[PDB]
Design a protein around this nucleic acid. Structure first.
Ligand code: CI4
Ligand code: CI4
Ligand code: MG
Ligand code: MG
Ligand code: MG
Ligand code: MG
Ligand code: MG
Ligand code: MG
Ligand code: NH4
Ligand code: NH4
Ligand code: ZN
Ligand code: ZN
Lengths: 368, 184, 368, 184
DNA sequence: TGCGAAATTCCATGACA
DNA sequence: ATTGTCATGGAATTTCGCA
DNA sequence: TGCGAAATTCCATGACA
DNA sequence: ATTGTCATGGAATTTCGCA
């Protein structure tokens, strides 16, 4: 108010208003002659309303708001008040984009053994082939060995059917999947408890987390496409072929095929490797154990020059999953309860629940 | 001569007819010669066509150099020979009336019949659903001659389902009683 | 054939087969004792068939194919034959992904004057508001000044309606648009010739080329979203508001609003800048001409470490636009006729036509 | 006193009734005081409501500090005053029966009536479609008092449509003939 | 103990929709 | 309560064949 | 002729679907 | 016959106020 501004019009020094400028009166308003021209100094009790009117014109950020205000006013530390408003504009906070990138991705260790961890997923809908529309893909984490099953839907019932056939071979310690309807059902839960299999889920809307199997999907679609060039897309009869072809393909970085990492010896397929012809099986299995433990493993890449990593108690916002036309892309702010690892957090969510989410589906809330 | 390996030789054979279960009447039995690993496939008939359908599933996982069988119709048909030739699998027949495998295989095949018999009594109609659990049993069964189970020899690792209670595999008083009743 | 291989079995030196290895016979086949083990040397007349069978197993690239062959064979310069096959596999060439990035983007000069160049586009479908579903967006290249019109469809007829109203203000030299149905129609062509307006089109499927207006779309959707927070999405009545709000918003890098770049003076809007209060109009227009010519202009960023730039006569492939499920993502190879600039080419296309396409919708064909 | 600027003052007025054209009967005329730039809007009536609808289009491009009008009903209504106040536009009325503008504006307004009259003869029904071309004409017309057209003073640049054949704007023998026939 | 060429390894690119 | 992946083909680097 | 703080400029991020 | 763009908010840098 006029408290400070009275005390100024005479010529006493108030902290923040630099002494070397002349602060007069005119038209009933305190003014000042600043290099850029003459500007009104409003009373402190007017300042928030001003910053707010300027910000609301087009819901602009720090500079674009300041330049509007600067047109008519000066006062000390304008941007501090501007930023105060930006931090409280519900509408800006939930609609604006982030400009900080996620921290560098983790490269989890490879499962130590075949059957320690299965990654599973559906591809589809594909063009109908014999009344089939999807493929269940099951990928052993350690070996890359992959099983394919054609289904009529990405349903729990068809998942259970196919895995009953698969697990006739071995039972896996863990099965990791995303949060598809087929995997999160209680039926599937029961099906797994019945066998002492642990169900592991990806954070929601984050397929990188099923990267092992997602990546194998690419190879499956790619080979299927090539085999189908200038033919009708009858893929059902090619699943078996694509399966065997891929399980027996070399990985240039590893120098092994998934079949070899699984069995330690080629079967009767074309170009079968014969290097262990003179070893006993037991010597062979010895060599396999060795090969398994020394496979190349990548490491987290450098962080980008403007990433953020979550701190306990920080205000962060979850990305809205399927945002309606003309609706905000972000949820209201929420707090980081726990930091599970540098790329995964638990938050106290938009209702009042605990949610485990990927850092890729969060931004840090701006202006604190 | 080079040492024996998995995929060197699969021994195949039919078992049945059995009481119908989800529409099925037979079990195609595949046993790896070196490891003693067993795969079981349920079929509607002992035909070339059912054999081919089933072996097409297995051979999309691993291909044997040799298939050994008796002179069953399904296996001596020229369709079945065309199939095998297409995949570079050599066929091998035991002379008629004189079945010969290997002791390991003989013994494995024996266990298979016994363990089946044991579970079809009481539920002679519910075996289709049980084939998974049977295979895990057979493949995690310890072999006296080798230090190791077939799971172990196939994959070179212990199994998340060890079958530590090496079973009876033997018909109790209440089972001999309602098996000599059901088959009467 | 056996020509060279006879001459070798005795012990004479053939170019390519190194002398220090022993080349014997066994099972009716030429062999050799290489550090990795004993490998068959097939006759030259067998080699292509072998490379082909190995490649076809899963349509693998250079190394993953070589490792299959190496399992049974050795011969001199295996990869040369492998690469020869990869270059001829129709199926691999049109299905595989590229692994070379485009050259660095151009930053075309800003139009020199208001009305030299309009960039136009449709946003929508939006939620229906008064029976309206789209917005025609028209953006002056030089100033950023934007006009908005609500329409019922992205049609030529509604484009013509709106531009008749707009061009009552001035007529533009050029109107740049993408290849939407509404802009490529002959009716629209005639409508423009009638006024001595030149129609300029983006390369197909390349919205970056309309970047000026695409980018303005973002701001329009963003402000509309904020104004609609917890209200029904009734956007029709907000067009006028969003228009005026955006035309009068500062660009932090430029320090001018589009309205100022257009008129050189603010109108009676909030926070109107008053710096030229004492200038005559003519002095003001003098200052505007100055401000216009000295605006910040960005420059092409550094090339990525693995980009390609098109050379006349090169084999390149156009990306299929809307590729069906399980169908290739690339067209057959074609030849670069002319290099219009480093990011734009004319090619002799997949039928037999001339096409002007963006380098972003091309890969260079692999293995020459 | 500070020099005169664009947006300082808009002068507005109705012209009509005219023969119907695509349903319309009037032209709201807006002329910028400083530059002489003209905007024209077709309306169905000289009402506050039609005025507001039209000025809402214009004022989403630029807002005048002052609107000047005569004491037409539409402009003196308290709805129209509420509108103007909402946008911080001051209203300004010439005293009744005594219209006063500025010479520039007077002259501009004159040209507008003449150029209209000229094009409604022969096609008295097709003017709605012609309003665009009329405005470009008026705004690319050279002003004797200033060295410059309104386009030039508004945008500070030459125009892609110069109207180099400063027109007749005058009724020929065949037009006086079928205008004294149509209005008889 | 060094050269030219081949073989191997490196790694940015892009797609799992 | 969880976490990216890896075929690909030019280019960079190392190894091979010979002296 | 140099300090501490404020003001300005820089610029990677991401969305135009 | 053509071609990316620019609001955003932390951080880096420069300028201001004072001595
Ligand atoms: O595969 C799926 C998938 C998706 C949504 C829901 C599901 O249930 C899925 O399985 C998206 N998606 C493709 C995809 C897009 C981007 C990055 C990666 Cl890594 C990726 F795999
Ligand atoms: O706006 C359009 C648009 C599209 C397809 C056909 C049209 O006619 C369009 O107008 C896609 N698109 C969004 C878009 C995606 C990615 C980059 C940029 Cl720059 C971008 F603008
Ligand atoms: Mg999924
Ligand atoms: Mg997936
Ligand atoms: Mg038999
Ligand atoms: Mg478009
Ligand atoms: Mg667009
Ligand atoms: Mg009047
Ligand atoms: N890990
Ligand atoms: N340019
Ligand atoms: Zn806001
Ligand atoms: Zn191929």
């Amino acid at each position: 108010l006029d408290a400070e501004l009275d005390q100024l019009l005479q010529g006493h020094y108030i902290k923040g208003y630099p002494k070397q400028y002349t602060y007069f009166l005119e038209d009933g308003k305190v003014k000042v002659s600043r290099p850029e021209g003459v500007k009104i100094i409003p009373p402190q009790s007017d300042r928030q309303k001003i910053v707010l009117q300027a910000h609301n014109l087009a819901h602009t950020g720090r500079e674009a708001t300041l330049l509007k205000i600067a047109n008519l006013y000066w006062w000390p530390n304008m941007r501090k008040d501007v930023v105060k408003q930006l931090g409280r504009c519900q509408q800006c906070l939930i609609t604006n984009a982030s400009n900080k990138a996620s921290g560098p991705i983790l490269r989890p260790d490879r499962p130590q053994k075949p059957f320690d961890k299965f990654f599973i997923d559906y591809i589809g809908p594909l063009p109908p082939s014999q009344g089939y529309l999807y493929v269940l893909v099951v990928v052993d984490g350690m070996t890359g060995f992959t099983w394919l099953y054609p289904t009529k839907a990405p349903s729990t019932s068809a998942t259970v059917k196919s895995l009953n056939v698969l697990t006739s071979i071995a039972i896996p310690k863990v099965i990791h999947s995303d949060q598809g309807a087929a995997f999160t059902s209680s039926t599937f839960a029961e099906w797994a408890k019945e066998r002492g299999i642990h169900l592991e889920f990806s954070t929601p809307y984050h397929p990188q987390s099923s990267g092992k199997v997602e990546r194998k999907n690419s190879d499956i679609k790619r080979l299927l496409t090539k085999l189908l060039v200038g033919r009708p897309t009858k893929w059902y009869d090619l699943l078996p072929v694509v399966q065997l072809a891929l399980n027996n393909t070399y990985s240039p970085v590893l120098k092994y095929t998934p079949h070899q990492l699984l069995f330690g010896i080629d079967s009767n397929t074309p170009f079968a490797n014969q290097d262990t012809l003179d070893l006993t099986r037991e010597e062979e299995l010895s060599l396999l154990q060795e090969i398994r433990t020394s496979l190349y493993h990548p490491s987290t890449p450098p962080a980008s020059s403007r990433s953020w990593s979550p701190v306990v108690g920080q205000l962060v916002q979850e990305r809205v999953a399927r945002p309606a036309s003309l609706r905000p892309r972000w949820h209201k702010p929420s707090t980081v309860l726990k930091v599970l690892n540098p790329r995964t957090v638990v938050i106290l969510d938009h209702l009042g629940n605990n949610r485990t989410v990927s850092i890729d589906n969060l931004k840090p809330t701006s202006h604190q | 001569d080079r040492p024996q390996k998995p995929f060197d030789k699969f021994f195949i054979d039919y078992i049945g007819p059995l009481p119908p279960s989800q529409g099925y009447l037979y079990v195609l039995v595949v046993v790896d010669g070196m490891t003693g690993f067993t795969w079981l496939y349920p079929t509607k008939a002992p035909s070339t066509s059912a054999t081919v359908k089933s072996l097409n599933v297995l051979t999309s996982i691993a291909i044997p150099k040799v298939i050994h069988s008796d002179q069953g119709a399904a296996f001596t048909s020229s369709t079945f020979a065309e199939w095998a030739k297409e995949r570079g699998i050599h066929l091998e027949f035991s002379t008629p009336y004189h079945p010969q495998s290997s002791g390991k295989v003989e013994r494995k095949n024996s266990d298979i019949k016994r363990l089946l018999t044991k579970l079809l009594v009481g539920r002679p109609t519910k075996w289709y659903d049980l084939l998974p659990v049977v295979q895990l049993a057979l493949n995690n069964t310890y072999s006296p001659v080798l230090k190791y189970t077939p799971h172990q020899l196939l994959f070179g690792i212990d199994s998340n389902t060890p079958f530590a209670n090496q079973d009876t595999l033997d018909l109790t008083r209440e089972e001999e009683l309602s098996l000599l009743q059901e088959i009467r």
